[PDB]
């Protein structure tokens, strides 16, 4: 939108930015715990978050394990108090990760290819704590985040 | 999160710990890379029955987190590698610790070293496909490890 900006020119300028420049940090993101139950209050707060793709974590908010789509909630009975884990175990929505220095142009093309979906999570290798190096999620980026970056930048 | 290391016909798939939430997409990544065996070097935390139904066998070779594998683990790891390459040389062997960054890449490094690569070449090859995949302590023992062509034939 924004005047039908040139995607070719806009996507070229995305090379000057990375996912860390447009990502939503994990502290600011709306996320669900794997132990959450899908009663009406939970379903209501999901329906009112405005998001169609809800990150699901296990234990820590940084331990993102899967995704909840609004479509997955269409045929749940809020009186059943269906556990979110039972839903995620059924749909098994995959989750994909990138690094903070991933340039937006490559991320924009990977989103348009559909190989990983339209939401990518941003992780880093934490190698300070003694033991094996482990991944630590710090944020999330969506195709919509890339689109509004293209719209906010028309010359 | 997979990573396919290949050197002199041997193929290694460095994955992370599969979960029961996303085990189906883990199995397809194994089948996509012609993986029949999964070596688990961390503590068991997922159901192994579903993998067995799809033909994927799981071998438990766990050791302490962030350390160097004991000799019994190294010998068994080389033993299972020699068994799978003679059974099907086109078949890749999957290895995973919790995130595929530590104990699993170290076993692959030892195999690459046993095939003719210096430890700095093996580590760089792993990190080329798996960023930050070895800690300094595990590197300190990779540099001291002495190969002897234990994967010659």
Numbering used by the authors:
A (entry chain A): 358 to 512
B (entry chain C): 13 to 165
What does the study report here?
Phosphatases of regenerating liver (PRL or PTP4A) are a family of enigmatic protein phosphatases implicated in cell growth and metabolism. Despite their relevance in metastatic cancer, much remains unknown about the PRL family. They act as pseudophosphatases to regulate the CNNM family of magnesium transporters yet also have enzymatic activity on unknown substrates. CNNM Mg2+ transporters are important actors of ion homeostasis in cells and mutated in genetic diseases associated with Mg2+ uptake and retention. PRLs bind to the cystathionine-β-synthase (CBS)-pair (Bateman) domains of CNNMs.
A truncated PRL construct (residues 10–161) with surface-exposed cysteine mutated to alanine (C104A) was added to the CNNM CBS-pair and the complex purified by size-exclusion chromatography. The complex was crystallized, and a diffraction dataset obtained at 2.5 Å resolution in a P41212 space group. Dimerization is stabilized by hydrophobic contacts between Phe397, Met404, Phe465, Leu500, and Ile504 along with polar interactions such as between Lys428 and Asp249 at the center of the dimer. One iodide ion is stabilized by Lys428 and Tyr426 at the dimerization interface of the CBS-pair domains, whereas the two other iodides bind at the interface between PRL (Arg139, Arg143) and a neighboring CBS-pair from a symmetry mate (Arg372, Lys373). Structural alignments give a RMSD of 1.1 Å for PRLs and 1.9 Å for the CBS-pair domains. In fly protein, both Cys54 and Cys109 are found in the reduced state. Outside of the catalytic site, CNNM Asp458 makes polar contacts with PRL Arg143 as observed in structures of the human proteins. The structure of the PRL–CNNM complex from flies confirms the interaction surfaces are conserved and additionally suggests that phosphorylation of the Drosophila PRL catalytic cysteine will block CNNM binding, as observed with the human proteins.
